Paper text:
Four helix bundles are also attractive for synthetic chemists because its interfaces are dominated by side chain and side chain interactions, which can be more tunable than β-strands. This study focuses on TmFtn, a naturally dimeric protein consisting of two antiparallel four helix bundles, as shown in Supplementary Fig. 1. Thermotoga maritima ferritin (TmFtn) naturally occurs as a dimer; twelve of these dimers interact with each other in a head-to-side manner to generate 24-meric hollow protein nanocage in the presence of Ca2+ or PEG. By tuning two contiguous dimeric proteins to interact in a fully or partially side-by-side fashion through protein interface redesign, we can render the self-assembly transformation of such dimeric building blocks from the protein nanocage to filament, nanorod and nanoribbon in response to multiple external stimuli.
Consistent with these recent findings, our results show that, in solution, purified TmFtn molecules exist as dimers and can self-assemble into 24-meric hollow protein nanocage in the presence of Ca2+, and addition of EDTA causes the formed protein nanocage disassembly back into its dimeric form, indicative of a reversible process of protein assembly. The crystal structure of 24-meric Tmftn determined at a resolution of 2.2 Å shows that one calcium ion located nearby C3–C4 interface is coordinated with two acidic residues (Glu51 and Glu132) and three water molecules. Careful analyses of the crystal structure revealed that a group of acidic amino acid residues are lined along with the C3–C4 interface, producing electrostatic repulsion along with this interface in the absence of calcium ions. This might be an important reason why TmFtn molecules naturally exist as protein dimers in solution in the absence of metal ions. In contrast, calcium ions near the C3–C4 interface can essentially eliminate such electrostatic repulsion through their interaction with the acidic residues, strengthening the stability of C3–C4 interface, finally producing the 24-meric protein nanocage. Besides, each protein nanocage is composed of 12 protein dimers, and any of the 2 adjacent protein dimers interact with each other in a head-to-side manner. Based on these findings, it is reasonable to believe that calcium ions facilitate the interaction of these protein dimers in a head-to-side manner, resulting in the formation of hollow protein nanocage. In contrast, native TmFtn exhibits a different packing pattern in its crystal where 12 TmFtn dimers assemble into a 24-mer protein cage.
Author numbering:
A (entry chain C), B (entry chain F), C (entry chain D), D (entry chain A), E (entry chain B), F (entry chain H): 1 to 164
The structure:
C-alpha cells in the first residue's frame, strides 16, 4: 500500500520531473557555452546537469520506499541562448530559487498533513538548495568583478572547467 | 565556421534528441519495473538510460567538432506501463530497431552529400546498434524460455541487477 | 537535574520498552521459522531482533543525556505461531507501522512542549522507520510473487539468510 | 521429530527464558548504575546482558537440534533500585547461583531420563557458571575492601568500564 | 542579495558573537584553573574555547552563504575567578543552558518566518547543545561524588587533561 | 610565588590582551573580505587570526611559568569596513607596527627592572614582528603594482588563499 497521500505523491513526482527539467536546462546552457567557445563553463554545466539527475533519483527512491510510483512527464524545451555568460548564470539563479520554493511548498504541504517522514526526507534538499544557490551566486559575483574582461573570464573558465 | 551542412547538422541534432528520448524511455521502463517489484530489471533499465546519455553526448561532441551547435528540443512523455517484463523488453527491441534505422537514414543522407567525415563517424553507432539489439534479444530469449516460472525470473532479475 | 519533562521522559521510556518488545517479537518469529525449517528466514529475524535492541539503546542513551532515568517494564508474551511465512511478515509490517505511529506521537508531544532537542533527536527514527517498513514490504512483495512455490521460497530463504 | 522428552524440552525452554530474564535483569542494573552516574559499572552490566543472550541462544540452538521447538514466555519486570553498588553486585551473585541451581535441576532431570545428550550439552553451562559466580565474587571482594572510599570506587568503575 | 531577513541575520550574528564570548569565557576559566595549578582542567577549558570558535565559524559561514554579512561586536570582560572547580563547572552549565535557549529563540524566530533553511541549519546546534550540556553535567556529577577529596579530583584532572 | 614584578606582569598581561584584539581585528578584516567576495584574502585573514592566538598563548604560558596569573579584559569592537583591499592591509601594517612598539615598551621596562628572563623571552616576539611587518609590506607591494587590475587581484586572492 502507498503510505504517502496522493497529494504528497503528486508534489514529489512533480518535483522529480522539475529536477529532470533542471538537468535539461543546464545541458542547454552547456550547448550555449560550447557555441560561444567557453569549454570550461560548458563543462561546469554538464556536471551540473548530472548533479540534478542525482536529485531526481533521490526523489524517485523515496517515492517507491513510501509505496508510491513515479510517472515521467513531458520535458519542455529549455531556452538555448542567453545574452552573455552572466545572463545565463542569472537565469540559473532564478531557476534554483524557484526550485527552492517548489521544495518549500512540499515541506509545508507534508507538514500540514503531519507526514513527518516526508518533512524529514526534505531536509536534505532544503540544505542542498542553500549550497546550490550559493554556488551560483558565487559565480555571479566573480563575473561581476570580471566585467567584460576576457583575461578574467578565461581564468573563471579554466577554474570552473576543473569541476569534479 | 560549420563544415557540416545544415541538413546533416539537423539530422545529427535530431538523433541527439532521440538518444535523449531513449534515455527517458528506459527510465520510464525502470519506473514500471520498480512499481512491479523487480529491482534487478529496473537497475538494468537505469543503467541503460545512462548508456543512452553517452550516445547523446557523442553526437553532442561531433556536432561541435564540425563547427555546429546543438539545440535541445522538447522530450515527449514516454509510455509508463507495459503488460509484463517481456512486453517491456519487446518494446525496447522495437525502439532500438527504430534507432538503428534512424542512424541508417543519417548515414545515407551524409553519403549522398559526400560527407565522409559524418559517414565514418556513424560507423561506431552502426556497430553499437548491432550489439544494442542483440543484448535485448538475448534477454528476450531468456524470458521466452523461462516461460512464466517465477524461480527463473527471480534469477534473471538478480543477474541483470549485477549490470555494471 | 532532568531537562526533559516527565511526560516526554515517560513517552521515550515507553518507546524504549516498545523496542525491547519488538526485538522479542522478532525472536519469536525466528522460533516459528526455525520450527518450520526455514533457517534463512529465522536468521533474518534474529538479525532483526538485534537491530531492535540497537534502537532501544539509542533511546536509553538520550534519556540519560537529558538527565532522565530508564525503567524497564514487564515484556508481554509474543505470539509464537503464524499461518505461513507471509502471515508472519504481515504481522511484522503492521507492528512496524504501529512503531512508526508511536514515534510520531512522541514527536508531536515534544513539538507541543517546544522540546526542540527531542523533536530533533527523533528525526533519526522517523527516517529509520521509513526504511524499516520498506524492508518488510519488499519481502512481502517477493513472497506474493513466490505464491507458494517452494523453489522461489528456497531462494528467498538463502537470500535473507545472508543478511549481515 | 523431537528426540528429547517434553519434560526435558520444557526444562530447557524454561532455562532459555530464564537466561532472557537474566540479560534483562543486568540491563536493569545498568539503568541503575547510569542513574547513579557510574558509567563503568553500567558498561559492565550492558556487556553482561549481551553475554546472557549468548547463553539463551545456545539453549535455543540445542532445542532445535533435538527436534524441539522454543516458546518465548512473558518476561517479568526486574527491580530497578538497589541500595548501592555492592548490593547490586550481591544481587547478581545470588542470581547467578540461582541460575546454577536451575541448571543443576535440568542435569538431574535429564540424567534420570538417561538423556545423555542433554546431560553432556549441559556441561558447558556448569563450567561457565563456576566462572560467572567467580567473576562477581571477585568484584564483591574489591568492593568490600574498598569500604566506602570514592577514590577506589572510581578506579573500579574505570577498570570495569574496560570490559571487552 | 541577502535571502535571510534582517531579523534572522541579526539573530544569527548575535549568536555568532555569543559563541565568541563563550570561547573567551572558557579561556578565562583556564586562566583560573592554571592559577590554581590544575593543568588538566585548564587544558580541557582551552580545548572548550577552541570548540566554541568552531561554532562561531559555522554561524559565520552560514551567514555569508545566505548573502548576509557578519559584524563583530565588543566582547565583554568575563569573570576570571570562581569559588573552586565545582563552582566553575556550575557556571559553565548555566552558560550552556543560556546558549541552548538562545539557539531555541532563533529556531522559533526562523520557524515563524518560514525560513526553513535557517530552521534546518540550526538542527546541528540543537543536537550539539544536548551533548554540550551533558558533558558539563557529567563532570559536575563526578565532582559531587568527589566531595572535596584531592585523590578523586586528581583523577578527574588527569582524565580531562587527555581531552583531544 | 610570582617572580616577575606586578608592573611586568601587567605589561605582559596587557600584551596578551592586545594579541587577542589583534586576532579579532584580523577576523573582522575577514568579514570585510568575505563581504566583498574575496575568499582568498578572507582565508589569509582567518589564518592570521589564528596566528595571533598562538602569540597570546605564548604570553599566557610565560606568565604562569613566572608564577603570575592571566586576567582577560574586555575586547573593543574592531572596525568592520575598509576603503578597498589595499586600505585593509595598510591598516594591518599600521597595527603590526603598533604591536612591535608595544613589545619594545615591555622590553625596555623589563630591561630597566633587570628582569633578564623577560627581556630574553621577548626576543622571539621582536624577531617575529620583523617577519609579520614584512609579510604585510610584501602584500602591499603586490597590490601597489597590481593597481586596479582585477586579473592580477584574482591571482593574488588565490595565492593568499593557499596559506597553510
Ligand atoms: Ca551543487
Ligand atoms: Ca548496450
Ligand atoms: Ca532494518
Ligand atoms: Ca562471564
Ligand atoms: Ca559529538
Ligand atoms: Ca563539546
Ligand atoms: Ca606571520
Ligand atoms: Fe536539484
Ligand atoms: Fe539545482
Ligand atoms: Fe543510443
Ligand atoms: Fe540504445
Ligand atoms: Fe525499532
Ligand atoms: Fe523495527
Ligand atoms: Fe547465563
Ligand atoms: Fe550469568
Ligand atoms: Fe557553542
Ligand atoms: Fe558550548
Ligand atoms: Fe602578534
Ligand atoms: Fe601580528
Amino acid at each position: 500500500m502507498m503510505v504517502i497521500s496522493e497529494k504528497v505523491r503528486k508534489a514529489l513526482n512533480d518535483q522529480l520531473n522539475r529536477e529532470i527539467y533542471s538537468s535539461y536546462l543546464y545541458l542547454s546552457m552547456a550547448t550555449y557555452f560550447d557555441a560561444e567557445g567557453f569549454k570550461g563553463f560548458a563543462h561546469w554545466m554538464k556536471k551540473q546537469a548530472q548533479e540534478e539527475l542525482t536529485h531526481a533519483m533521490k526523489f524517485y527512491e523515496y517515492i517507491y520506499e513510501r509505496g508510491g510510483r513515479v510517472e515521467l512527464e513531458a520535458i519542455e524545451k529549455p531556452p538555448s541562448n542567453w545574452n552573455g555568460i552572466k545572463d545565463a548564470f542569472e537565469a540559473a539563479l532564478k531557476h534554483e530559487e524557484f526550485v527552492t520554493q517548489s521544495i518549500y511548498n512540499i515541506l509545508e504541504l507534508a507538514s500540514e498533513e503531519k507526514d513527518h517522514a516526508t518533512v524529514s526526507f526534505l531536509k536534505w534538499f532544503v540544505d542542498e538548495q542553500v549550497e546550490e544557490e550559493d554556488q551560483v551566486r558565487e559565480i555571479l559575483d566573480l563575473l561581476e568583478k570580471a566585467n567584460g574582461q576576457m583575461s578574467v573570464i578565461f581564468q573563471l573558465d579554466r577554474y570552473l572547467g576543473q569541476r569534479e
